[PDB]
Amino acid sequence: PIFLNVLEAIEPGVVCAGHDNNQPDSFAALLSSLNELGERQLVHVVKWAKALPGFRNLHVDDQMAVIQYSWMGLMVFAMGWRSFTNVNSRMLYFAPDLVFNEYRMHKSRMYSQCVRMRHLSQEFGWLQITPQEFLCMKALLLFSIIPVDGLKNQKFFDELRMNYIKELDRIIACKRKNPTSCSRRFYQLTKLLDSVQPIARELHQFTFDLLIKSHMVSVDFPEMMAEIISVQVPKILSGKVKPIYFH
Ligand SMILES: C[C@](O)(COc1ccc(Cl)c(F)c1)C(=O)Nc1ccc(C#N)c(C(F)(F)F)c1
């Protein structure tokens, strides 16, 4: 199980937001903590991504672009999983020190998105997603959004994405001699992975609007995040960069 050994081995550990939970909730503080948390997780997403099998094959510019585009979705997916395993989807486990109840979902002004992620969290349970299916599905997510104009080395990207799909097939076939059983599972999983995109889109849109009026709501946007939101996110919202759906 070389491939899964690698995925387990590089899976980021716990990342805290540094939020002050002794302070009454507020939009400004919850959002600054979400911004800071997002940035902290990005540090790990980059280290994770670069240690992924075959990733280094991608052109240097493609590696960075793909990480930045996939950044939101990857966080959404892992957060839903953490929410499921830690609190049985009762709340959204953004981080040990940043857990959202409905009140916080409402106060963050990201209520519709949070509810959608809570449903995703429940999906992990309802579909009985295994830790290994999760790990492989997450790696696949990193290769699920590309520019219409194409990457520097599109062929390398396609090969890599195809190999990751092949690994998902193997994890699914492992202990399923019934083809019909494998097919239904692949259907369920690709359906779950597609559901992540629309959620990341609503968060992208929300964050973009927020950045534009950040000075009007007292939100502190970190350096790297502001740059990525103003350079990369606009490409997604305008349709120049699109997610790869299965269905
Ligand atoms: C608003 C924000 O602070 C920043 O989100 C962005 C992150 C990346 C990009 Cl490309 C963006 F446009 C916004 C945020 O959503 N942070 C955030 C931090 C951690 C997690 C986790 N886990 C999440 C997520 F994915 F659950 F929604 C979100």
Swiss-Prot record:
Instruction: Give the organism, scientific name.
Output: Homo sapiens (Human)
Summarizing the annotation, the consequence of altering H204Y is:
In prostate cancer; increases affinity for testosterone and androgen sensitivity; increased transcription activation
Phenotypic consequence of F84L: In PAIS and prostate cancer
State how changing K177R affects the protein, per the record.
Partially prevents ubiquitination by RNF6
Positions bearing the site annotation: Interaction with coactivator FXXLF and FXXFY motifs: E227
What's the effect of swapping V219M? In AIS and PAIS
Where in this protein does the record put region Interaction with LPXN?
A: 1-247
* Part of the full-length chain shown: 672 to 918 of 920
**What is the annotated localization of this protein?**
Nucleus; Cytoplasm
What's the reported outcome of changing I2T? Answer: In prostate cancer
- What outcome is documented for mutating T85A in this protein? In prostate cancer
Tell me the outcome of changing D220N. Answer: In prostate cancer
Mutating S144N leads to what result?
Answer: In AIS and PAIS
Provide the protein name.
Answer: Androgen receptor
